[PDB]
Amino acid sequence: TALDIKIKRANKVYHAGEVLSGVVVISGVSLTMEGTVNLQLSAKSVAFYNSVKPIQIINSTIEMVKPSGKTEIPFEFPLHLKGNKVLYETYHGVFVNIQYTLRCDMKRSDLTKTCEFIVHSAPQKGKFTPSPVDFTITPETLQNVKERALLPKFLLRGHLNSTNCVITQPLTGELVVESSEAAIRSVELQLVRVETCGCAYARDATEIQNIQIADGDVCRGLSVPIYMVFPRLFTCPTLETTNFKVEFEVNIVVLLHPDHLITENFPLKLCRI
Amino acid sequence: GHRLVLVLGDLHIPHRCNSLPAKFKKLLVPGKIQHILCTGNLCTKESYDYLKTLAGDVHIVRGDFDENLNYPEQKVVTVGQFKIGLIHGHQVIPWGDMASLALLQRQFDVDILISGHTHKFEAFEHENKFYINPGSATGAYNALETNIIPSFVLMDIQASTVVTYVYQLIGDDVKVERIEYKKP
Amino acid sequence: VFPWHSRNRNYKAEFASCRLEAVPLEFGDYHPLKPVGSDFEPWTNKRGEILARYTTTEKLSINLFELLNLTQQDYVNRIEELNQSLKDAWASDQKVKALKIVIQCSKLLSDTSVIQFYPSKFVLITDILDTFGKLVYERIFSMCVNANDTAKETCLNWFFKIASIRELIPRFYVEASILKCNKFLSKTGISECLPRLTCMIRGIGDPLVSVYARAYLCRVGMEVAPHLKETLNKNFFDFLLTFKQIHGDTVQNQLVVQGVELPSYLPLYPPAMDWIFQCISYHAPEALLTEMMERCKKLGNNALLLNSVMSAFRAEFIATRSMDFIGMIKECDESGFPKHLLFRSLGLNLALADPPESDRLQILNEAWKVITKLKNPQDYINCAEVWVEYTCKHFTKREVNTVLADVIKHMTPDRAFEDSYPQLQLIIKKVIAHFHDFSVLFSVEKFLPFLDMFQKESVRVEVCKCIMDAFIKHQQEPTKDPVILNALLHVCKTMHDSVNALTLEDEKRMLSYLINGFIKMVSFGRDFEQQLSFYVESRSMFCNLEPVLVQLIHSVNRLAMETRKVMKGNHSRKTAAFVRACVAYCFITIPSLAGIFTRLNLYLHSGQVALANQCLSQADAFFKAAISLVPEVPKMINIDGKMRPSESFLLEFLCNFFSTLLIVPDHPEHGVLFLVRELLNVIQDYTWEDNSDEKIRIYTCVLHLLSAMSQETYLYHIDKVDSNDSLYGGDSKFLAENNKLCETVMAQILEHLKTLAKDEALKRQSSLGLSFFNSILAHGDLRNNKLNQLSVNLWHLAQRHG
Incomplete structure (x- = not known):
């Protein structure tokens, strides 16, 4: 009676277009991949700019097992965001925190675990000029x-x-x-x-x-x-x-x-x- | 099959002689001697160590002057098809008596007996028995002789034939003599 | 049973008949006897010296994360506790705690509260780092079995965690500890990380901390990537860049605040520069060593640097450039690093590699002009111990004499000997190591006054043993130069005077061996009288040690027989007195001996050597004294420290005594069989053990002796002594008395046999009967009816009870 999420890549980094693949290990259950931009309001610096609200990057839910021993089940998501929404870089800031998390929850008459996977921004178009x-x-x-x-x-x-x-x-x-x-x-x-x-x-x-x-x-x-x-x-x-x-x-x-x-x-x- | 044995005795180093005659060290080389029987009078651990560098098998008995007394008075050791009996020689009364040696071989029931108190070299067969008295390798003095010539015997044992090569230093020359023995 | 008849024996005829024919051998006839590497000194060894030398008695403080007033041993215990906590945390899967413990331990190296303890401290904390460095590595290796992604991820996590450390010194130490792990990230990781650490060391402003950090970096580089020397040369060059700070104002103010004088602050540096230079100069080309030498020369107070240059560079390089190093040493400032330490290092170099021939005299002269001006005895001996090797190896006995005189002059005044007993021993050993011929060593005028320096008892005797070992192993011919004899006589006196009641037996054996080695090598040629003079002064000089007396007795008997052989037996009137003096010498000498069986054996040998010179009376005195000493033999004797029975030894002694008294003539003033008669009385009166039957063995030996002596001619004769065979001429009365003695002995043997039979001990009775029958067959005349019947009865009795 215990859950775990194992992301395929050891470093757990995935770019803006790759596929997030892994295995859920147990000993009905679903899994949700959510990316958030949490912005924390601070001491005012300048109408109180009441537009500082959480921004949902990605939302994807998969019904994985419909309602013993060590059981493993594979899973995969596509990391895609319409045509113009960019996947922001993972950033553990203080007032701006961009985090991508998988959450596996199993129902019982509910055991949950959250594991974070890192997303890396795509390399620049490229004319890298150092500025000494x-x-x-x-x-x-x-x-x-x-x-x-x-x-x-x-x-x-x-x-x-x-x-x-x-x-x-x-x-x-x-x-x-x-x-x-x-x-x-x-x-x-x-x-x-x-x-x-x-x-x-x-x-x-x-x-x-x-x-x-x-x-x-x-x-x-x-x-x-x-x-x-x-x-x-x-x-x-x-x-x-x-x-x-x-x-x-x-x-x-x-x-x-x-x-x-x-x-x-x-x-x-x-x-x- | 050839077995080489070094019959020695009466070194008496350093009680009566500083060391072996200079040549005898040259004529003796390590790795070429199979057995080394000594009648005794080593008088030091140093002479025993010198013998230990000359062979691996070192059978040595107690003399009348040995520093280490753990030396067995009488030894019987078997080489080839022969059994050799080794005593120092001062036990026999009188010294070098053939009757005494015959009695000692009767007690031992041994093929050949070594007894070398009298430093004068001897080699004789009596009643189908072999007897060798090598004498003093260093020529240590004894009251029973006027001139003592350094000497040492070499057993060569093959099946049932023993050829004995005795090396005696006279003046400045290393004379060598041959004697033959065959088991009846 | 029955009377005895002696079988007639013709020794000459029997020997001739039984003698085996022998064929001589001419020339050509075949007779069998015909004809990083081992050069790199590891840090593990230097650990011991650095920990031992750099100890402080002040109260230390180990502040982690607060502890005060800690002694050095408690400081070491606390560091060991930290190391054990590291190991336990790692084995418990708490890696973050392990990292933080290592970080704090490294932080301890950034503190210089007690400067004098910094080297040993550096040695302790670095151990933890090593314990970290391996312990991390194995983990990644355990994940490896271009490794898998898990091992690379763990290695990158460790490197990032370590790169996140704030303080510079902890970051450098912890990162250099796991340099090996860079293997798992790229094939060029070490080659890209080592120069960066070398440059990072520049941030350390404290010279001592920076120097020890450089030493640790060099150690890690050599135990990880010893083929990257081009990177590690930057350590030496940056160190020379930083060297100006050692004598700068800031460090002087820091020392003033801590109240530490510069003569004590400077010697804390060599433990790290020696390692740096050794690592950087290992198998280095001569061009690189040269460039380092001129870059060290061009600086200021480089007196310290030069030391490491001698302490690390190959001996050949310093030896060839030794005059230039003398020049560099000369202009060094006096108030800074001591000059005598530099001279000691240079001398140590010249003890391994020779300097150029044209420069040796100048080097020795200029080294001694500076060494002799030292005031402190301790550092003076530290230099002189090293340079005596050079003086003895290259130059003659005159310079060795001058050096020894200088050493004596320096150490005599203020009783400095007690502070340099070990070092002085070393010096004397060296003087003996390079002077084999002892006609030259004792020609050194001040050699004996140097021995007079060791006025302690335990210290002096060891030097005497060294001298004597050297003499016995470097003297293959007898010598007579009176300079040699007197000097070794003095050494043997001062080595033999150490024998007391408390002295162990093994020490006595070793001393006896040494003085015997001396005595054996004194041979006065044909001057036999002066040799006896040496022997009498020897007994007067070496009374206490018994084996020396034994060797002296053997050697005086050797002199007597040597005179006999030289004169071919024809004793002269002048030399009869000499041989009588020698035999009387021996007579006086034996009774002093302590061991019993040794006394008996030496009495016999003295007797035989006595009769060899036609002098009968004192020989009879010897036999009488031996007989009188016989009853003193104990039942239970000492052999090789253990306890053993004296039965068989007594048997063999009596057997030898009988065999000797075969030839001994009987004085006309007394009866026949005289000495034999008293020996028979003694052996009968001896308190033989109840469970012992060797007494009848001895009576059988008596029968053998009397049968042999009853013959017309004895088997062996003395050169010019008339034995009983020629004295009495086979007289009827002598033979009758001998036969009466035969009957008495046989009656005693038969009575003992009857007692054994009545005792029901049939095994001993059978053995006795068989041995007696063998004796009768040997000597008893079987022709006689009574004796033949007795032999038959004995054989039947022996076979009756097996």
Whole structure:
């Protein structure tokens, strides 16, 4: 008296046109494949934009067994959406969450289990052009003249290989601490999701992960390698639709010895090729 | 089938001799000796170790001066179709008496008896019995002789015929002598 | 029973008739006797030294996820508990807990609260990482059996989880731990991940943490992909880029805050640079080693770097470039890493590979000019132990003498010996290892004063055993150079004075073997008197050890017989006194012996060697003393530490004594059969065991002896001693007395046989009867009617009871 769903692919990723095939294992029963875009209302930023409501991507139900031992039964769905409705990338965000789930339920006089399968956006048409960016973290980067006076004199030079990043490829670059009067306690990368909901409109920025790249007083003139692996389901290609936007930024924050923090923001543009 | 045995005795190292005569070490090579019978007076574990590097079968009995006393006083070991009896020799009263050796072979009921207290080499047949006294390999002194020549005997046993090659160093020359024995 | 008649025996005629004809052999006649690899030192070994040396007594703190005031042993126990928790969590299918435990353990490596404990700490925590690295790998391998999609998915999940780690040092350590798993993602995964980790290490700002991280990365690379050396060279180059930070301002301030002096902060670095350089220089081409050498030279305070250059590079490279390394050592700053450590490393290199011939004298001179200026005795001996090997291997005895004198000069003042008993031993061993001929070793003037340095008892005696082993195994001919004798005499004295009541028997055996090895090799040529002088000073010198006395007795008897053989028996007036002195020497010497059966056997051998020189009176004294000693034999004796009966040994001793007294003449002032008569009295009076019948065996032996001696001519004779056969000339009275003794012995034997028959022990009675019949057949004249009847009766009695 127990159910389980086994999706054929180990990685459980399926593209916008493939076929979702698997086996349901037991020890009448139906199975429903539902994809949802859950948008969570937030603190107002700008008529209260009361259009932030769940969006159903896909709805498909199969009556699998009409009303012992280890039993297995195959199943399959076609991943198709009319002619213009796109299957959004799986995205475990905070205010925008795009999730595809299979739900198997068996009636009794009802045992249910939900298993999530990932959907990957189709590769772009393809003219991938990296956009290398050079930057200089200086005391003239903090957006306050009042605090800037207490900042020790520092100068860091860096080069991001591309702000237009392939999501399967890591963010690579170099950072050279040309000269810092105060000892550098830590330099870390901070991937910040920028999620927007509604129209003329709630916009939030939330940290996904922090990855420290420089610990302690690094040699002055040594190229510390900026390396960052994008998280699997917490990052998606930059998505824009009339109801919601999901963008991504990276914040290089330098920490100095007397608890001083300096932020440089680079808006990335993730894509799949 | 040929069996090679090294009949030895009275090394007395180092109680009376520093080591074997220089040549006798050269004439003796490892991997070529099948048996090694010693009448005794090894006097050290070192001489026994030297013998152990010369063959695998090492039958050695107790002398009047052996450091290790676990040595059996009398030994009877069978090689080929023959049985050899081994004692040091100082048990016989008097030394080298043919009557005493005959009595000892009667007690042993053995084909051939080895008894080498008297360092002077002997080899004789009496009453269809074979008797070998190899003498001192290192030529250790004894009160019973004036000049002692180093000597050591080599059994060669084939079925029922034993040819004995005795190596004696006289002056600076290694004379070798042959004797023959056949079981009736 | 019945009287005895002796069968006539003609020994010469019987031997001639029974002698087998022998055919000599000419030349040409056939007689049988005719004619990563093993060169890579693994991290497992270095584990022990790093853990042993780097120990701190300060209270440590292990903060996870808070614990304070922990000792080193408790710190190790807590790390072992963390490792066991890792293993249990993995075996319980809790992989996330395993990952978090490994992450925290790696986090511990980012803390430098106690600098002195960092190396050993690095060795402990890394073990957990290794335990992680294998334990993950097997799992994917367990899924493998270009692997299946499940194994690849698990491997990618692990790599993503590890790539999600925030702190840099934990991320690097955990990711490098599972570098092997990169095999399951692509054939180029390791070749694409190793350079990235090497570059990632640049983020570590603390020099010590970065250096040990580089060491771990090199270890993982060599135990995973040892064919990617081109990638790992970047570790050495980036390390040289970072080396400026070791002596920089930030680290100095950190040490000041922790209150740690630089002379103690620096020696924490070699454990990691040695590994880095060894991995990077393994089978490297000479061009790469050269380039590393000049890149190390061009820096500043590179005194530390040079050490690793000697500690890792092949011995040949450093040996050829040894003069340049001397030059580099010379300008090193004194306040930094010690210079004597660099000199020790260089000397260790020169102990394996020889330097160029033209430079050896300059190298030795410039090394000793710096070594002799050290003030601390301990590091001085650390250098000198290493460099004595070089001085003894390449140069002559004069330089060895100078080095030994310098060592003595340094260590004598402040009783420093106690701190360097082991090292000094090593030195002395080396001096003996390269000086085989002992006419040269003891020509070294300061060799004996060096032995005088070891004033402790246990330490000194071991060096003496080493000297004596070297002498016995490197001296194949007798020597006489008085320098040799006096020196070995002193060594044997100072080794024999260690024998006391507490000394074990095995120690006494080993010491006796060594002093015997010395004594055997002193041969005074034809100067027999001075050889006896050596023997008397030896007995006075080596009194305590019994086997030395035994060997001395044997050797003085050997000298007596050697004089006999040299003079061909014709004793001279001058040499009669010498042989009498030798035999009196032996007479004095035996009674001192402790063992009993040894005393008896040596008394006999002394007797026989005594009669060999026509000197009869003291020989009779020997036999009388032996007889008087006979009753002291115990029933139960000691053999090889165990306890064994003394029955058969007593039998063989008496048998030998009888066989000897065959030839011994009887003094005219006394009666016939004299010594035989007292021996008979003693054996009759001996407290023989009730269940023992070897006494009648000995009476049968008595019958054998008297029958043999009743013959006209004895079987064997002494060179110039008139035995009873020639003294009495077969007198009728002597034969009658012998026959009366025969009747007495036979009456005793028959009485014993009757007692055995009355005792109902028929097996022993039958054996006795058979043996007595065999004896009668041997010697008893069967022609006599009474003796033949007695033999027939004995045979019938033996056959009656089997």
